[PDB]
């Protein structure tokens, strides 16, 4: 009740008055992920909180055998662009991160010239088409017409049938977003509605936008410099074990942060004027690393992030249900990603022959993942603009590889990916590029350096869930406690996105400080009739309403009577404008 | 083809690169109205044109007997807020005009406590309700469903019948926007679609927002100071008589500006790199002024603005058809407005008794016009926050009065308003406030000072028109010539608004300089299903779909079958959210 949603330039460009009594308030942010950093930025810029009163608590201190790549953006990351228009670029003078990003993606717009391959390097013949049947389209629409409240614990396989899963649409969708068939239909529905304005860019990634470098260099480092320039305090080697919260009949008040500061057990006592921002849960927690000759050791370890959320959930069911997300994760789930770095011309030339661009040119390369449709692992890989690390040699590329299925033997390396060294993952990948099999072993072992990473929780955002499993950003009656990040709850936005991190941060800061400025709503595209007309046209692989209805009597007649009632009206002009007539 | 429309924060917050070759370009803006000033501001900020190369050409030089008041804003003036977030306030340090305006309208939000009066000072009993019948509602919707291309030269009386014109809706609508029954149905349609998101605020003005002072002090003066601080050149006593334009088979190029600079006939020769921004036509041209004892003398004079547009239209029909707007204006049209200033407690107390607020308190007073429904003149009046001039005595108010009908005897002063002195207009107004008739003459003649103004073209924006009567902002193949202001043509936006002035200015500058940043589209509210649901609910005076259909078989049955097919779905939840179920 302490915020309101808005849209349009009035609320975008307006500045909030300094919030009431902020001069006597402090902030503690648990973890240094994007959501914590964003919340600190809003605390500085819009809360006008004093930097020395803002404390970022990081578990790690202030050696992997190679480069490791970790996601993209779209124009309607409304909250994220509100943030980064205020963060100075570290690459361009007198320019924001938004400016640098905006100009770069106009100079070198992202698109894919090859989205799906099969048969050891051949482009899928129907690449670019959705190959959705009428039944599959109806299931998509029926899911969207289902209330979110009726999708508690429903799996994607509960709402779609064979036609949909055989479609190219599902190939594009599951791989670009990392949906597994057992994942949350509720989240899949949110994604369908959230990105409906970009349906025309699904097959070719033409709606995706990327930073110049990896996320740490292009997003985190600029935020850090901004926060440091305003005196914000960074606390390393601090493990938050619990937060004692009073949950009374009238209020929720965080009372004390129980920490281990460099082996020493200490405690931070809080008043109502000391705000606590918890990033509950983590998809990168407990990650392990291999090298070119060693697999990343599988693990089920619960780290500090999941232990902390469990300790908060013990104090109120309003603080969420972490076990839905970190327990009972199927062993087929995506766990392993790998970064394969090479300067070898044979590999780089093979990539060029598939993606149609020079990987070393410094512009778009694959334009997003290429999916190997017939790979047992259901592997995809991408090469961003190179190099993605500013100190990497200019003759090197780093390729990011991931597998949706973790418990199935590969086609060339006949083992599950979880049993594979870096070079074995690279060999399986090189096989599917069409590299001659008598060269694969040496090119992977001696011409490349591949670092695998095992992430027990990388699919955790998407686990089947029920309303209530995620805490509200500001739980009911909370006075000084907020939850931020991709396991907190807010309307219609989609998790596994950087936008969701910034949105929850902004909503938390605005609500706890009662900031008198609107939060931009999730973009209104699923309510926009023009966008919905485009979606019907795109989903039906570019067929007008007559062609859609051509083989059915019940519809071909309803359409005849509809066209007779709209003839010569604005509705007919709109349908013609959007190619439905 | 030299611009694109956008929405959302990405394009709002992004800055355009410096446009190509702007260092060798100059700009001439004809007139110093809002559109010219806005275009100069965009030339500085986004064109990065040198201030000394920007020339504002004003006909007047660098004595009325009293104060003269001249409109409001809404949140979705998308282009105007893009502009004024960059203009420094002259009232608050380190703040924009947008900030000052945003904070003021949150501190003192606008609303009316009395919108319509009758019978010499009594509130209309049904004030607040639209009193629209089903037939009237159907005509509203049928107009919106008509293509704009089918409304050439159609009058409002061609598309509405008796029920609509007897509605409270039409009272609110015609007076707040100054529509006459013979005005353009095309523009009325644009207004219905343009402001559909504010239908719930039509009766009480709760969607209106106002500057602190009159428009000159709160909008023009800040822009002027901004332009002067950047070296922009202001040219006074310059009358533009013509612009010689080459209209070839391949290009339109302005060649020379023919001027009279202080009685001297001179000429400004232009290259392709010299841009010309013409504000074609004017609603204030040829205005005459009276005083407390003298009517403003009626006139049909064509001034420099209308002569110039006629001289441009002689060179291409693509430059518009001014005669549609400045000729054959019916003599019943609104011509006269008056500003009545008083410090008299009897008058001020009578106003307080009607509007329910202290006129001298410095906050909202009437919250917008009060309409005298049974006045022969169809008179309305408003009192903004006082005082509206920063050097006015603190015990004074200034009331703005206007009459939609100019050729009908008044109820107390039995003469058309065009024959009335300032004090006679005030007397007619005081009669309709319920002032005792034995006091009206002395309170108007000796306790008030009323300045009338006769404006032959004040209704000119709304004259019946056809596609093509207004020039495109940048006509086809124009290299260096643009048209801006409320007689230029752009999609869906509404004239008689300051937003239209800023929009045309922005579109002209962006197109002529090929600026690489989106222009915000007219707000998408008529395509937003949520907004349309609200509109149905509001237009039907807050009745759900069952009550709307209760007295009809064809609809009450179609609704039964519709409800049976949407039961338990998201569509039903949406309808319930918006009170239609
Ligand atoms: K905002
Ligand atoms: K924009």
Numbering used by the authors:
A (entry chain B), B (entry chain B): -1 to 60, 71 to 78, 81 to 591
Sentences from the paper on this structure:
Flavin adenine dinucleotide (FAD)-dependent bacterial oleate hydratases (OhyAs) catalyze the addition of water to isolated fatty acid carbon–carbon double bonds. Staphylococcus aureus uses OhyA to counteract the host innate immune response by inactivating antimicrobial unsaturated fatty acids. In this study, we deduced the catalytic mechanism of OhyA from multiple structures of S. aureus OhyA in binary and ternary complexes with combinations of ligands along with biochemical analyses of relevant mutants. We conclude that OhyA accelerates acid-catalyzed alkene hydration by positioning the fatty acid double bond to attack the active site hydronium ion, followed by the addition of water to the transient carbocation intermediate.
Glu82 on the catalytic Loop coordinates the substrate water from below the PEG400 substrate analog in the absence of FAD and also forms hydrogen bonds with three additional nearby water molecules in the active site. When FAD binds, the catalytic Loop conformation is altered by its direct interaction with FAD, and the Glu82 sidechain is repositioned to form hydrogen bonds with the substrate water. An overlay of these two states shows how FAD displaces the nearby water molecules and rotates Glu82 into a catalytic active conformation connected to a single substrate water molecule. The critical functions of FAD binding are to (1) exclude of all but one water from the active site and (2) engage the active site Loop to position Glu82 with respect to the water and rotate Arg81 away to allow the oleate to enter the active site torus.
